[PDB]
DNA sequence: GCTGGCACGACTTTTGCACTCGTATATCATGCTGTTGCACATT
């Protein structure tokens, strides 16, 4: 809020927690071999 | 006859010369780059 945001909007700064998006067909894939790294690897065919 | 500005032979001044020894901070906000640590595929 406030208006360190007309500045924040125009510089198009990436926020702290971006929301992920998807592609044409998001079939159920959950995560294959979800190791200690980033888990829930979604692989929509 | 009286006087007042011009040149000459000593003196005096300048100049290249280039040559060496010789007290402090405490604005954040952001973006970019570099180093190191760690997960994943390989023979």
From Swiss-Prot:
Post-translational modification: Acetylated on several lysine residues in the presence of glucose.
Practical and industrial applications: Co-administration of salinamide and rifampicin or salinamide and myxopyronin suppresses the emergence of resistance to both antibiotics.
Top-level division of the source organism's lineage: Bacteria
Family the UniProt entry places it in: Belongs to the RNA polymerase beta' chain family.
Function of the molecule: DNA-dependent RNA polymerase (RNAP) catalyzes the transcription of DNA into RNA using the four ribonucleoside triphosphates as substrates. Resistance to the antibiotics salinamide A, salinamide B, rifampicin, streptolydigin, CBR703, myxopyronin, and lipiarmycin can result from mutations in this protein.
Subunit structure: The RNAP catalytic core consists of 2 alpha, 1 beta, 1 beta' and 1 omega subunit. When a sigma factor is associated with the core the holoenzyme is formed, which can initiate transcription. The rRNA transcription and antitermination complex (rrnTAC) consists of RNAP, NusA, NusB, NusE (rpsJ), NusG, SubB, ribosomal protein S4, DNA and precursor rRNA; S4 is more flexible than other subunits.
The protein's name in its UniProt record: DNA-directed RNA polymerase subunit beta'
Lineage: Bacteria, Pseudomonadati, Pseudomonadota, Gammaproteobacteria, Enterobacterales
Full protein segment contained here: 1136 to 1180 of 1407
């Amino acid at each position: 809020g406030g208006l360190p945001r007309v500045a924040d909007l125009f510089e198009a700064r990436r926020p702290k927690e971006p929301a992920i998006l998807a592609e044409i067909s998001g079939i159920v894939s959950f995560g294959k071999e979800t190791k200690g790294k980033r888990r829930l690897v979604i692989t929509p065919v």
